[PDB]
Amino acid sequence: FGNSRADMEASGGNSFNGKGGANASNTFSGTLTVTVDQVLANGNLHVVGEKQIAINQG
Amino acid sequence: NYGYQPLFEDRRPRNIGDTLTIVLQENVSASKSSSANASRDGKTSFGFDTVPRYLQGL
């Protein structure tokens, strides 16, 4: 053990941090009058409708 | 003719083309964590500050 033959010192480190995420949203509010353009075999009604508003510059 | 229709039974989809309302309500959350540690400390000493004569050679 003389002459620092067995003296030793070591250190080590390892680090990892990952993360992730996502999100989506949508809202819609209004009222629209549509018209029936087809009646299906079970009585369900296909409906289509369009509202066009022009206010000033569009 | 749309066939036989029950009077008091709740309106359910029964055939191809029938509609059904799905209320999407999903809430999933999982987590895990762990750790481990180990430690060891050792100190040792011996000193002869004053050595009597009969012990000198040792």
From Swiss-Prot, chain A:
Compartments where located:
Cell outer membrane; Bacterial flagellum basal body
Instruction: Report which superkingdom the organism of origin falls in.
Output: Bacteria
Q: How does it assemble?
A: The basal body constitutes a major portion of the flagellar organelle and consists of four rings (L,P,S, and M) mounted on a central rod.
| Its biological purpose | Assembles around the rod to form the L-ring and probably protects the motor/basal body from shearing forces during rotation.
Q: Which family does it belong to?
A: Belongs to the FlgH family.
Q: What is this protein called?
A: Flagellar L-ring protein
